Amino acid sequence: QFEERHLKFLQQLGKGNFGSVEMCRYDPLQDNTGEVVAVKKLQHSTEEHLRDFEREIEILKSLQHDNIVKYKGVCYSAGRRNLKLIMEYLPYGSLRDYLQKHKERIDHIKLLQYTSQICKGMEYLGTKRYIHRDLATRNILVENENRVKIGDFGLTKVLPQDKEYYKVKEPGESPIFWYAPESLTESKFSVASDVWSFGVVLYELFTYIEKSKSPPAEFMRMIGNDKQGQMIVFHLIELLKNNGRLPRPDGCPDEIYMIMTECWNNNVNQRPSFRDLALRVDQIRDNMA
Numbered sequence: 330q331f332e333e334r335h336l337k338f339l340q341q342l343g344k345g346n347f348g349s350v351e352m353c354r355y356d357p358l359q360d361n362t363g364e365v366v367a368v369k370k371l372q373h374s375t376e377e378h379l380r381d382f383e384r385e386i387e388i389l390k391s392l393q394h395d396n397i398v399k400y401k402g403v404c405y406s407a408g409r410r411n412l413k414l415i416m417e418y419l420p421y422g423s424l425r426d427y428l429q430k431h432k433e434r435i436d437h438i439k440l441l442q443y444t445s446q447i448c449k450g451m452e453y454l455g456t457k458r459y460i461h462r463d464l465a466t467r468n469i470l471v472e473n474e475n476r477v478k479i480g481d482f483g484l485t486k487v488l489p490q491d492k493e494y495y496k497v498k499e500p501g502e503s504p505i506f507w508y509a510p511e512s513l514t515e516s517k518f519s520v521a522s523d524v525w526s527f528g529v530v531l532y533e534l535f536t537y538i539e540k541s542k543s544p545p546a547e548f549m550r551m552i553g554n555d556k557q558g559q560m561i562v563f564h565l566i567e568l569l570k571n572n573g574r575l576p577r578p579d580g581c582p583d584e585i586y587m588i589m590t591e592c593w594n595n596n597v598n599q600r601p602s603f604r605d606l607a608l609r610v611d612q613i614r615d616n617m618a
């Protein structure tokens with residue numbers, strides 16, 4: 330229901346894998362009263378990528394939650410393709426950049442507020458049997474100082490009816506340093522691996538996105554920065570097999586790190602639920618206040 334001729338390009342907001350998001354104004358009355366929106370498109374409209382995109386659009390459309398970015402509509406020109414996803418525009422950018430920019434005014438209670446919101450959004454995904462597969466502060470957006478939203482769903486898959494995991498191995502880079510061990514070894518993605526990645530998100534938050542402290546930097550320094558191409562993955566697997574883990578971030582209390590390390594359990598079935606993670610984060614945040 331969005332006509333392409335009324336979307337006015339303003340700037341690029343972000344560039345994902347096979348996708349990009351643009352800040353546009355939807356101004357059908359041509360009087361500069363229309364609203365600014367976010368428009369997602371494919372960088373190269375492959376038939377396979379187009380079918381993935383259609384599934385992503387339906388997934389997002391099916392989601393309604395304070396902590397999930399709002400679907401608004403779709404757009405297409407010159408027939409059916411050039412397909413574009415229209416979403417609400419969130420003015421503070423990604424939580425990665427936002428935390429980096431205000432580290433001296435965002436204290437731990439605020440971090441835990443964001444954490445809780447992320448947990449509740451992920452739990453909502455779970456009730457729909459959706460596996461996000463790409464949890465990272467770079468894929469959390471900031472609506473305002475009090476609200477974050479899960480921001481991108483390009484890698485989200487729906488669980489089979491009969492199984493609690495989805496086996497997929499895609500070409501491209503994969504965010505290996507947020508991957509559960511069973512995702513690196515068997516391409517198995519589950520709620521439990523989303524929980525692992527959430528552990529990494531919590532690490533990210535408490536590092537305040539410091540340069541040398543990113544999961545890639547830390548993990549490369551634990552395996553050796555020389556490590557060569559695909560060998561990287563292999564060593565990562567071995568490192569995680571021997572319970573090598575990201576270190577406790579500077580200033581991070583013991584209980585928060587413990588939440589992280591319980592998320593980083595090699596035994597998929599021993600990782601906590603998102604509801605319990607929310608419960609615990611909320612108890613800590615209420616104790617701090």
Ligand SMILES: N#CC[C@@H](C1CCCC1)n1cc(-c2ncnc3[nH]ccc23)cn1
Nearest residue numbers: 342343345350367416418419468480481
């Ligand atoms: N998530 C996220 C990260 C990132 C890219 C991930 C893959 C493609 C985009 N990205 C998303 C925005 C954005 N910014 C403001 N409003 C928005 N609405 C909807 C998105 C969006 C900016 N960069």
